[PDB]
Design a protein around this ligand. Structure first.
Ligand SMILES: CC(=O)N[C@H]1[C@H](O[C@H]2[C@H]3C[C@H]4[C@@H]2OC(=O)[C@H]4C3)O[C@H](CO)[C@@H](O)[C@@H]1O
Length: 514
């Protein structure tokens, strides 16, 4: 489709994908690209940097403060007082000034903006973080952390307990704990009162406390996380820790009776001889309908209707799409429609995988459920394609160089036959090197480079009191940490449905290297 037909379609990730594809093939003229900013659902990342190679946009700065960016560190004392304050938002700017000008600007600002005063005087020292910490300036602490992550220093109880009141705190704690940077910051965060944190912050501080073997503080942190978490999956992750640390059976019972199906609730059910949860069964009699499951545009359309529906338009959609041909959509609508209380694990386009061994089938289906919910024409924000969410680099390399498919286009990933076959091929490569389906899941999402780098560390997936569950919490990419846990649960479930059950404790045992 030409840029002109693309312009007639609604903004969406599909449209973006296709505009990107013209860009990468250099088929968009400077003229085509004029009105094109209005035609991009999500102007971030690749399509942005690619369209800015044609029409650079170097904006934007408000007409108000335009005079203010005509001054440099050399001429800043000639600037009016508003301009002075604007430029001092940048800690790099402040670092650029000489110390005489910092002293002067610091006196100007001590009345109305002592935040500025403190940063100004801080950069007149060999250690700005220490100066800020001594003044207990919370806003300054975070501006310094964002400016430079290499500042590290011990923080007292008074101070650490103020940090969680700032929006930066969560990202700050997550980062330094899973990356294992700022050891003095980490050690100091052992004195945060659990009362003062909640949710993810509380959870990550529980993980922190485990790493220093402070199991009491860890429980309190995990407990506070259990009581505050919005989603049940996260509550469960926290209840599981509560149990592992103390071993109260009230905790494990709550976890075995969870409405959320996840690895922690599954493991707990196994440990308590609780029966496997009820998996729905969808077998629509209706054979097909009008809907083109191979049209990416139709999907994005119907996907917006499903998202933006009262739980009553849903029942109109559910019935419209209650067919064998639109089964993946049916299950998608149903999942939302029953408020995520029912467990849907379909096996669509099964003829394409029925001749693989059942353990392989489970792995493929588990990946596809998380990647796509089995939507053939699914496109991610990084433009990963189809049910198995292949990046176009990898899809083209497999399809052109390896499997030598004739007339291979990357849009072939929209075909179930192909998605499942390339999925099988790529998983074969990963399994043969990594073995565990959890490790395979990490590498399917984050690449095998990152996974091998992680497994080579001697603090990851080794033996230890709290292993392998602690390592699972310390996987360094957030997206991959979450992905693994989910795909693993999907794997258990699908092995079960396939009559190829495995104890999840068996999976956890083979995560440890001896
Ligand atoms: C289409 C899409 O955005 N897919 C992405 C996937 O997101 C799914 C999840 C979260 C949403 C999204 O599409 C769905 O149907 C739900 C299941 O997440 C993965 C990382 O975990 C991504 O690797 C994958 O590309």
């Amino acid at each position: 489709y030409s840029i002109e037909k693309l312009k007639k379609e609604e903004n969406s990730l599909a449209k973006d994908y296709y505009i990107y594809r013209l860009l990468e093939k250099n088929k968009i003229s400077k003229k085509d690209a004029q009105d094109l900013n209005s035609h991009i659902f999500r102007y971030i990342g690749k399509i942005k940097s690619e369209l800015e190679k044609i029409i650079p946009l170097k904006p934007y700065i408000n007409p108000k403060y335009a005079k203010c960016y005509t001054y440099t560190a050399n001429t800043i004392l000639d600037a009016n007082l508003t301009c002075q304050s604007v430029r001092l938002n940048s800690l790099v700017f402040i670092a650029s000034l000489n110390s005489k000008d910092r002293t002067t600007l610091a006196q100007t600002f001590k009345n109305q903006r002592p935040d500025l005063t403190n940063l100004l005087l801080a950069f007149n020292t060999s250690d700005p973080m220490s100066y800020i910490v001594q003044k207990e300036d919370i806003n300054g602490f975070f501006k310094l952390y964002n400016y430079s992550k290499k500042y590290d220093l011990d923080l007292n109880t008074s101070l650490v307990n103020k940090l969680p009141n700032h929006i930066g705190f969560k990202d700050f704690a997550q980062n330094i704990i899973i990356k294992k940077e700022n050891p003095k910051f980490r050690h100091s965060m052992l004195e945060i009162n659990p009362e003062n944190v909640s949710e993810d912050s509380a959870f990550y501080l529980g993980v922190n406390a485990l790493t220093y073997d402070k199991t009491e503080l860890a429980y309190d942190f995990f407990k506070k996380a259990a009581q505050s978490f919005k989603s049940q999956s996260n509550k469960d992750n926290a209840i599981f820790w509560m149990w592992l640390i103390k071993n109260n059976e009230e905790d494990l019972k709550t976890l075995s009776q969870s409405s959320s199906l996840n690895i922690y609730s599954l493991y707990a059910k196994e440990l308590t001889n609780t029966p496997f949860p009820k998996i729905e069964s969808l077998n629509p009699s209706k054979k097909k309908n009008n809907f083109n499951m191979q049209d990416p545009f139709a999907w994005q359309k119907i996907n917006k209707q499903i998202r933006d529906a009262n739980a009553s338009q849903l029942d109109v959609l559910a019935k419209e799409f209650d067919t064998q041909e639109t089964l993946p959509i049916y299950a998608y609508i149903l999942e939302r429609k029953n408020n995520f209380k029912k467990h849907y694990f379909i096996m669509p386009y099964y003829d394409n995988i029925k001749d693989y061994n059942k353990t392989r089938q489970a792995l493929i289906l588990a990946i596809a459920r998380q990647e796509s919910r089995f939507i053939p024409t699914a496109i991610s924000v990084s433009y990963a394609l189809g049910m198995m969410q292949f990046m176009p680099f990898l899809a083209n390399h497999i399809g052109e160089k390896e499997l030598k498919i004739p007339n291979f286009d990357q849009d072939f990933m929209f075909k179930p036959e192909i998605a499942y076959y390339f999925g099988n091929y790529h998983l074969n490569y990963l399994e043969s090197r990594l073995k565990s389906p959890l490790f395979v899941a990490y590498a399917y999402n984050g690449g095998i480079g990152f996974t091998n780098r992680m497994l080579a560390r001697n603090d990851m997936f080794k033996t230890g009191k709290f292993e392998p569950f602690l390592s699972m919490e310390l996987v360094p990419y957030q997206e991959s940490r979450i992905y693994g846990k989910k795909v693993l649960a999907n794997y258990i479930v699908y092995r079960h449905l396939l009559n190829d059950s495995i104890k999840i404790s068996d999976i956890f045992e083979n995560l440890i290297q001896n």
